């Protein structure tokens, strides 16, 4: 009975991720001193992860366990659209964090007058609008999923769509994240004190470390899938074994559950907020 225990393992992971992301959101919502434009981006990332883990992953696990779609064609389209939207929003909201930290490190003295709350929320809105355009846009212009059997839930088999989605949703934001974090790394390796003060320099070098951990885990989890799927859709004969191609799929979606572990195990204020929220 491989189905039941696999489903139980997956469900445990999804519930763990759901609680982790709710806890991350509450730790920032319920704390006055944690309300900063750079923490609202963490809350946005947690919101995308929470949507993915509470609305998308349960049905993905059921669909893996069963092996077919048991909820009709109408819910297939909605589930696929929400999945793609949340996945694109998560990575673009990580890219916006990369840009925010690059600005806060390169120009630590003008940062309060560059990244204002107005501009920070404008950036959030632009990220979400861009995610909607990149994700839900192509799903209509590239033959919204074709299957005609009411049990198949197959996003566009077209090679063009997978190229655009892979490029737009993984490889364009990854370039910005990696470039911006490298500059943060290079700057932090040359400057004695970032903002002339030791407390500020410490509090800026700690956040950069946490960002590096988040980015490293994200790349590690999501790179195998985006290396193995596009090649499969580009060279038809280079189809890998399904066992490894199932592992890379769930490895990528495990990030939405791991990230709330990254946040408190790297920072000391996030851990305290986690305790203060769990105790209540």
């Amino acid at each position: 009975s491989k189905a039941i225990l696999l489903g139980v393992i997956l469900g445990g992971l999804i519930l763990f991720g759901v609680l982790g992301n709710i806890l991350v959101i509450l730790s920032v919502a319920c704390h006055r001193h944690l309300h900063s434009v750079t923490h609202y981006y963490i809350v946005n990332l947690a919101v995308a992860d929470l949507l993915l883990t509470s609305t998308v992953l349960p049905f993905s696990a059921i669909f893996e366990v069963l092996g077919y779609w048991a909820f009709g064609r109408v819910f297939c389209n909605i589930w696929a659209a929400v999945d793609v939207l949340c996945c694109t929003a998560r990575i673009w909201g990580l890219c916006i964090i990369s840009i925010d930290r690059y600005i806060g490190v390169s120009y630590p003295l003008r940062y309060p007058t560059i990244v204002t709350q107005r501009r920070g929320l404008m950036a959030l809105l632009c990220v979400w609008a861009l995610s909607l355009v990149i994700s839900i846009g192509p799903l209509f212009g590239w033959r919204q999923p074709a299957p005609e059997d009411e049990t198949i839930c197959q996003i566009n088999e077209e090679p063009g769509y997978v190229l655009f989605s892979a490029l737009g949703s993984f490889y364009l934001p990854l370039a910005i994240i990696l470039v911006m974090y490298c500059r943060v790394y290079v700057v932090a390796k040359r400057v004695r004190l970032l903002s002339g003060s030791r407390e500020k320099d410490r509090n800026l070098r700690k956040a950069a470390k946490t960002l590096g951990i988040v980015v490293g885990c994200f790349v590690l989890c999501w790179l195998p899938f985006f290396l193995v799927m596009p090649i499969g859709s580009f060279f038809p004969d280079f189809k890998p074994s399904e066992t490894v191609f199932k592992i890379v799929f769930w490895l990528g979606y495990l990030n939405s559950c791991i990230n709330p572990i990254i946040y408190p195990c790297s920072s000391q204020e996030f851990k305290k907020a986690f305790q203060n929220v769990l105790r209540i």
Partner: nanobody
Amino acid sequence: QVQLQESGGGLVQAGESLRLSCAASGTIFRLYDMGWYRRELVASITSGGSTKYGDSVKGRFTISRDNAKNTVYLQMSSLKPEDTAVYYCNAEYRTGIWEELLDGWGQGTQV
């Protein structure tokens, strides 16, 4: 725990020169500002090469730093009867790229 200790001590009468040594030992990611103190500042070098001296030093001293082997030196010149109380070794070190800047002192020397 990074360690910096004095060196080059001894006994001599006025008119002769010395060369104290001080190098960093331990887990260091890099060193930023190094120099000697007498409490009072007598010299200091930054990682770039900007040399500084105290007002009491009328170009008397020459503090030198090697970027390769994490070592500093201080060449003495023209001892004075009332210019030797204690000589410390002060450095600011970082043990990692994502850690706070710290500093350490030395034991001391006298002549």
